From a paper:
Among diverse BMCs, carboxysomes are specific CO2-fixing BMCs found in all cyanobacteria and many proteobacteria. Carboxysome shells are typically composed of three groups of structural components that form hexamers, pentamers, and trimers.
The cryo-EM structures of T = 9, T = 9 Q = 12, T = 13, T = 16, and T = 19 shell assemblies were determined at 2.3-, 2.99-, 2.93-, 2.75-, and 3.04-Å resolution, respectively. T represents the area of a triangular facet within an icosahedral shell, whereas Q denotes the area of an elongated face within a prolate shell. Consistent with the T = 9 mini-shell, all the shell assemblies produced from the midi-shell construct exhibit additional densities at the shell inner surfaces. Although the quantities varied, intercapsomere assembly interfaces of each shell can be divided into two categories: pentamer-hexamer interfaces and hexamer-hexamer interfaces. The angles between capsomeres in these interfaces vary slightly among all shells (α-angle: 29.4° to 31.5°; β-angle: 0°). The structural conservation of pentamer-hexamer interfaces and the variety of hexamer-hexamer interfaces indicate that the change in the shell size is more likely driven by the variations in hexamer-hexamer interactions than at pentamer-hexamer interfaces (see detailed discussions below).
Author numbering:
A (entry chain A6): 703 to 736, 770 to 869
B (entry chain A5): 770 to 814
C (entry chain Y), D (entry chain e), E (entry chain j), F (entry chain 7), G (entry chain 5), H (entry chain A1), ...: 6 to 97
The structure:
Amino acid sequence: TGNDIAPSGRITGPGMLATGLITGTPEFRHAAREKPELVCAPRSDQMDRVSGEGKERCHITGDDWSVNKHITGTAGQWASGRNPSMRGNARVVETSAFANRNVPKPEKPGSKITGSSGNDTQGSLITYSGGARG
Amino acid sequence: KPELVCAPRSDQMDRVSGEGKERCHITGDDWSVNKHITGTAGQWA
Amino acid sequence: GIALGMIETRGLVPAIEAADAMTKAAEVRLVGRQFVGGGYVTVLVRGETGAVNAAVRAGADACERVGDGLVAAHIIARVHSEVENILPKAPQ
Amino acid sequence: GIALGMIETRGLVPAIEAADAMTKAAEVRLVGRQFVGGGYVTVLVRGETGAVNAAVRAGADACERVGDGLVAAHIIARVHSEVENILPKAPQ
Amino acid sequence: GIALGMIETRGLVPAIEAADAMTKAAEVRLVGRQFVGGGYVTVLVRGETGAVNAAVRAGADACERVGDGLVAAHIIARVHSEVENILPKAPQ
Amino acid sequence: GIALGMIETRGLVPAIEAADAMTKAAEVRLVGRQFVGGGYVTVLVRGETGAVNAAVRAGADACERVGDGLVAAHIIARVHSEVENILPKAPQ
Amino acid sequence: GIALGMIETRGLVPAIEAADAMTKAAEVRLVGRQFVGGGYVTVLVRGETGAVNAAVRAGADACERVGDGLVAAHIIARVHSEVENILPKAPQ
Amino acid sequence: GIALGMIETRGLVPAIEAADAMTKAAEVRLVGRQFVGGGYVTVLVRGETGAVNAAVRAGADACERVGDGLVAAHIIARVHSEVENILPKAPQ
Amino acid sequence: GIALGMIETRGLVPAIEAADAMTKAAEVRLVGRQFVGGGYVTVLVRGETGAVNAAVRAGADACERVGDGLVAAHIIARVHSEVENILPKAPQ
Amino acid sequence: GIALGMIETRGLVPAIEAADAMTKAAEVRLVGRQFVGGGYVTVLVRGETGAVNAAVRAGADACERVGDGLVAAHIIARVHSEVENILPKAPQ
Amino acid sequence: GIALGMIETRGLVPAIEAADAMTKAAEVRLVGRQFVGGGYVTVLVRGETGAVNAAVRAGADACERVGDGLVAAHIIARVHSEVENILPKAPQ
Amino acid sequence: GIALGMIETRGLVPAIEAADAMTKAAEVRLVGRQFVGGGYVTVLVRGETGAVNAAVRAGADACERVGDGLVAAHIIARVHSEVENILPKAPQ
Amino acid sequence: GIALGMIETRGLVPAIEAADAMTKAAEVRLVGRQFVGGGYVTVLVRGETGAVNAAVRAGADACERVGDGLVAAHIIARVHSEVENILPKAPQ
Amino acid sequence: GIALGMIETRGLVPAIEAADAMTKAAEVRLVGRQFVGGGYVTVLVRGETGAVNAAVRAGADACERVGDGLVAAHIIARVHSEVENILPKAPQ
């Protein structure tokens, strides 16, 4: 109670702008409270957990450092669960050269130039000052 | 968001052809005037 | 200023109407009126880049329903030195 | 500058908001506040055509829903020499 | 502070009640009262943005039912230098 | 003041627009801008809680539809002393 | 001048092409080319409100079709003094 | 700061939780913790209107369910000078 | 340590039982007992966050069924500096 | 150089736009602007083959959409001495 | 302290919120703020195991709804003595 | 004069292939490779307009299918004086 | 040992988890932590071929579900003398 | 050897495996690993065309499946003198 200063629609001013896009406001802090054919398995079909000099695609018989299921030890539960963790929900938006390989782009420039031009429409899009096709 | 900042070339043709162009949407304090601002152009010219 | 505002029309009546609307509308000066030939008549003004934009828009609106109408409205905010050789220096 | 931009509103509060928006948006000079009478309050700004165009547009948006309302937003890129007498030069 | 709080009303009785509630409500400094004409009366206060928000809310809901009523209640967190000429610094 | 207002945007064009809107809107001081990396720009302003609220809302509104757009708009009314080690001290 | 014009592009080739178009289109001063990171490259020009409005328009049109394209084209007619602490003065 | 923010709780433990939440949320200075008697513990903070609003809101939420809980959360933007005689100046 | 663990009970008998259990359970030092009034007695301990966690849990368990019963058990890992004014430094 | 770049347009407005773009986009010399009758205007520039090639590309793009449009855009890498007689030596 | 608390976010605004929350909640010393690149910003805190558990829990919950949000929150009660060579000792 | 030709690619390997092809095709001086950020790489060459035209055309063909790909290929026959300040003078 | 074991991850938090797990899993010394850019972080260890295999497998499982996740896991039994130059010798 | 062989991968781990395969496959010297940005990493080896051709063929195969993968594998039998400025000379 008391001298409320919460944003309201009756009182115009800056306080009413950007409703819903703002966080950390007293209003939002409160809301949060609430025999296989081949020795080595197919290269394409299988992906190895550790790729180099630790690959299990090739069936190396005899003595080897592979540990079966009945043998407990260092890996698995004994390494995964040592430290508590929390996986959050984030907006993973990739802004990079590869991500922009397919972007909505304007119409390709066209050259109506004639004469001693030496132009080639086949070649990759060369551009000239102004964006004119070169 | 708009897919392209400037409207497609052959889709439209600007009233004033160069440097008075309107195809490219430019946010900020540009010199565009909407219906609310009467004035220099229109029936007044 | 240096910006150039060009309005092109078919015939002379629309051009004179456009030169009158352009100069009255904004702070610009009528550098010239060239008879292109085949009907087209071009009126050129000079002024601040913002003033020229206002004048040409007013000029285009004025002369688009006078005679055979408007052909081309243009603004060039900075005109290269070479082009100034082919522009009317001052009205005849 | 020479370009003139006017925003007329019903009451003073819309006009003060319009003036703040106009003088914040672009380089314009608040030349006058005129109590027309009957609730009409006019704010006049002067500057370059581009600056005034942005200033008046920003002012119209700001005071559209503020108080009684906006009456008119008007831009004149170049006022006649005669009209310069009726226009205010600097505010009271 | 520099923020500005405005309340516009139809008459002088609502304006004084709004001015009384505004000053009592929060740490605001009543600066001006304006007779806009046509019944509009404006009361302007200055202070910190938080203080102004409290005062205008108190003034708006205190002067709403007295007299013809409340026309405009508005806040400006920062006021441009040009507008300071059109606002009344002295208490009356 | 000590309240911290933060706006995170994609690209610099939205961020500079937010900085202009934020500083213009309320009585806050720009303490710096940081290129987070991967097309993230964070603009920070420090001031009183009332001003920072008004500033951030103005910045969020201004830059919402500019360039790629707005990512975040946060207000920490009091930042622990430790966080001041990572916050920028003055703009560069 | 004081007005600021800004263009944001994906990559540097459209950024340089935009910068050339802006400076060739109108009498503006290129004050910075900033690598925002993540691809975005921002070119900033400063001049008169009319000149910058023309310069940015030419920059956007030329840069649109070059490379990945154009992200933003923005004018700020008046730049608040606090926001100039985060704006390059001479290009790097 | 002149605004007053008070939280009243049934039992001391919620009061200390309220004081902790209030003093962490915003820039509010704790002025006193009064044992009213009958199991009521009132914590008073003095700060700017924005800080007081933010702190009290945080205080009420934090101690809403801690122990017996909350009795009252009140914000006064300005207390009459006579009331300040019955308010703690420094905590005890 | 800085973490604060406090138990509030109805009557002194549960408070003494809680005080005994708290000190027996973990490495936490008793810092005070407050007679809140209305038959509320609050015992506070200070220690490391883990130690205080164990102490409060053991304290609440011991005094839950003792006498009138238990009102509140609360842990604050870090207590703001201002709140340190109202906490007892050492028991009386 | 001796390379001749020629752009023919319907009306003077596209011709001046073509000439402006051509001389701004390369190191060419504007030698003539010849009215042909029928509304055709032709702007002729001379320079090195590389410069003329870039200019005519820039000119054709700039004036394609301006006014009535473009008629021709041709490049002659080396001009026979006989043709030099019919070409204009200096702009008029 | 020896326990390490790390929170990773997809911006800097969620990182600053997370740091504020962690530092306020428990007794943790902020040791680093790293721009991993690609947008990710990681905040590392050091303290006793009990304090770190509360700090990370507070930080993880605070920044979840701010900006792009939380990528990871991790607690390593003791880090191998080799890992301490790649950890910051104090933010720059 | 001296022209500018630039090839923007995704990754360094395409850029070096463009830099190799461009310099082998004509007498163009490689002035700089820029890591724009986000995976864009730009290579810039200076030389006569004809030399730059042949170089860029050869570079665009060579690096089209190499690696992630080609983003942009640009040739600027005349580079404004202002834009020179943002271009590398020589490679490092 | 000279065998090299590398784990790559998205973000710093998964990388540190993997490094701690690898150092704790077997007899491997942590040599480097690299920010590859774009969110990738790589952690490198040296040691016996058998030990490195055990460590990397533990680290791969440890950081698989931490943060964005595991990118790559690699073991090189013998590193060519040339490659030793581009590998970190010890962590900064 | 003049010939240059470059492999581009997404992440450092594939690059390191590519470097080892390339150096072990033939007689090539690793001149440097570069972090292009956005996750791109490039390893450049130099040697005789025969050694470079065999090494890059082995390198692309070895790292094709490691981590995110391979982006580019290129062979330049002769590198121009100008391009040698932008290439690494010795690894760091």
